[PDB]
Design a protein around this ligand. Structure first.
Ligand SMILES: Cc1cn([C@H]2C[C@H](OP(=O)(O)O)[C@@H](COP(=O)(O)O)O2)c(=O)[nH]c1=O
Ligand SMILES: [Ca+2]
Length: 129
């Protein structure tokens, strides 16, 4: 896979963010994860975690997987990086996202993220407390 440039337009919630990619505004949905909705338990904490990570980054990048690059709602589907650190992984590692929505052929980082979930669960963090 390849990292590509993007810039933050606006944080949205734990697993979606609005970015400018190739000069166009897009909502991105993070691959392979599910955060609680803002209205649910840990939702506000997941939103705040992803907001801080993307707002504090000097450099945002997106990395598309091998399959679909957009979903049925027109959201980009990607791995997002903040100063080199994967947001999708970091939210799972802190127990603020579950591994989810693992579709065949857009699942390059599945094992990396399942290892992060196992660690968060062993630590009883957040969702796993
Ligand atoms: C993450 C992901 C979500 N989606 C779709 C499945 C779900 O459809 P439904 O809306 O019909 O439930 C929705 C979940 O996104 P949210 O968790 O952002 O609600 O997005 C994909 O199609 N591909 C993906 O990789
Ligand atoms: Ca969600």
């Amino acid at each position: 896979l390849h990292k590509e440039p993007a810039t933050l337009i606006k944080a949205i919630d734990g697993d979606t963010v609005k970015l400018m990619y190739k000069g166009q505004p897009m909502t991105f949905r993070l691959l392979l994860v599910d955060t609680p909705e803002f209205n649910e338990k840990y939702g506000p904490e997941a939103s705040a975690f992803t907001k801080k990570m993307v707002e504090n980054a000097k450099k945002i990048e997106v990395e598309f997987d091998k399959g679909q690059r957009t979903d049925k709602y027109g959201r980009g589907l990607a791995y997002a990086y903040a100063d080199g650190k994967m947001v999708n992984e970091a939210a799972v590692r802190q127990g603020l996202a579950k591994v989810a929505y693992v579709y065949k052929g857009n699942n390059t980082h599945e094992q990396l993220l399942r290892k992060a979930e196992a660690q968060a669960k062993k630590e009883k963090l957040n969702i796993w407390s």
